[PDB]
């Protein structure tokens, strides 16, 4: 199969390929109960008259819940789902160096504090 | 015998960490600054129902 | 009756025949509480005019679940039903070479890590 | 692709496969004539509302004959044809050491001699 | 009335009279709660032409469930009902020997270490 | 096949399983003339809609007599012929100590010496 | 199982249990083809009112042929078939000399000549 280690700063979380196809990867993580868990969606394809691609990468993860540690019957029962795709338009002709650049600047971008506070304190991007 | 005993009694002493908390000025600052834009944030969504 | 040692590992289990029938072979796992254990049902028969036969075995388990532990008052109640069904269709006029080469290829594929991480981590078969 | 081996005891076979697909994974044996092999087809579903799911997996061996060796013309031809068919109706909110137990189980059932006799004697399971 | 003392290994329970009457007896097992107790129903008859005798033993106990311990408000409930019935059909004009010998062998049949196995694990006599 | 030991005092009795059945299990004593023998049935089924169970016991035992040690010519005849069936109604989810406690009642209630006497004597059981 | 050892003079066949009932005992030969060979049934009873008693014996033995080893295809295909029933009504209360100087009155005139002749040359018994 294929294994992904995933570093949160104490541990490591490992994700497993389950759904090996071409037009459609699904990695699902191996932690403790399968169902509602962490699972990654990947998709690579083409557009048009063979000009540039598309890919596609969505990653979910669902919180589960269970009573059977107090209540004396339920089974672990999922709560909310949340979902975050993305999309790569990139043409093949193009260049390394601005691939490179993109990329980093994207990175920067991920690792700031701004990207952090506006996804916790759901306050506008604007520092 | 039977002895009776009162809970009351046999536990130890209280910590020495039941003290007054010590808070810096960049956490004031930084809370502050979070606690005003969450306001002003609550503010934009009252003027929707206008 | 007729008992049936079944092996584990660390533990040997015994099955006992409840309902001795030609049609139908109940045989019923003897442990604690009979009701949500261990059943198989076995069946033979023929077909069409006097060709093939036919074999049918199916193996159930139901857990169970019990408050009186903590609770004050919850009777043994079953949770799910696992059915896991068989169906053969050998002909009289066959190859016993054959027939012995099929059983030893089932007995692979059962022995097999493959299909044990199938029916543990449901990822499709295909290693 | 993929490939599948299975130790027969003093050879090695090698399944490949052919159809891959979701709800149709086909498997077949390479070692000469293609038409009249070794042949495994497996599928997954789930069921109902999102309770639990279904596995099938079958299994299919025709012998052929062939009188090329002795008389002047004759295509190989197959003869009989069998089907192991199986049924996995197992929950998702279950248990791992269950499933491991019942795994063993079957493991052990598979290896015991009782059912060999069954299958080539024909003699009703019942030891 | 009419006192009965069961020794029960450790302990002594009292059944007292509670119906005298010739053709049903019922005695009544007081320790506490009157309802869901200790029955024993006796009765003793003829047959057809003043040939032989029936004599009937029933044996009732009918477990009850409280909770007023935690619960503030329930009443004591039976919960299931447990029904032993006897006949016995012995002709006057026998034999005193083979009679005694007959209740030595059913005494020696209740006391044998198989009943109760019959009864805890619900095993078929057989050993 | 299936032996029972059953110790009167001074001689031990040997019972022979004969017909061996699911349904209907018949026991018989191997001692001299089977024909008018002792003889025992035992049955277990279930009830309803898979609540209970229901056991059946049945114990006879016919006596037999002959004159040929004086008279010229007569073959060996039955004369009498006792019943004495059982009936447990015991559910599955019950509770072992109290299935216990019940069986050792019913042991000392047949040890007791007042049972003995309504059989022999045929006095009402009341002391 | 059971295994029945029959000695033909210079070699030796072993018929096996199959069909393990009370009503109707199966045996089978185990030779080579398990279809069209040696089957045997047995089956025991009573009659009217406990009386005596009934014992039936069939031994049927159906001759095969095939053509694989000249002609390039014909399945094993059974010619004739023969039934050789019997039937013993043995009373209980009877007397064992006399049922011994039966039994060997049976065995010699199976062991004698006439009835070989009269099954060979199909000549009427009379010598």
Redesign the interface.
Known sequence: ?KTIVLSVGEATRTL?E????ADRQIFEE?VG???GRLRLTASLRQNGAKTAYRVNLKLDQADVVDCSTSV??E??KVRYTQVWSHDVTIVANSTEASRKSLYDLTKSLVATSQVEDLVV????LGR | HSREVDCERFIGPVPSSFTDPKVTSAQWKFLEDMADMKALADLNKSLVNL
């Open positions: 199969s497993t389950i759904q090996s196809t191996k109960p399968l169902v004396c019957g089974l672990p304190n759901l306050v506008p």
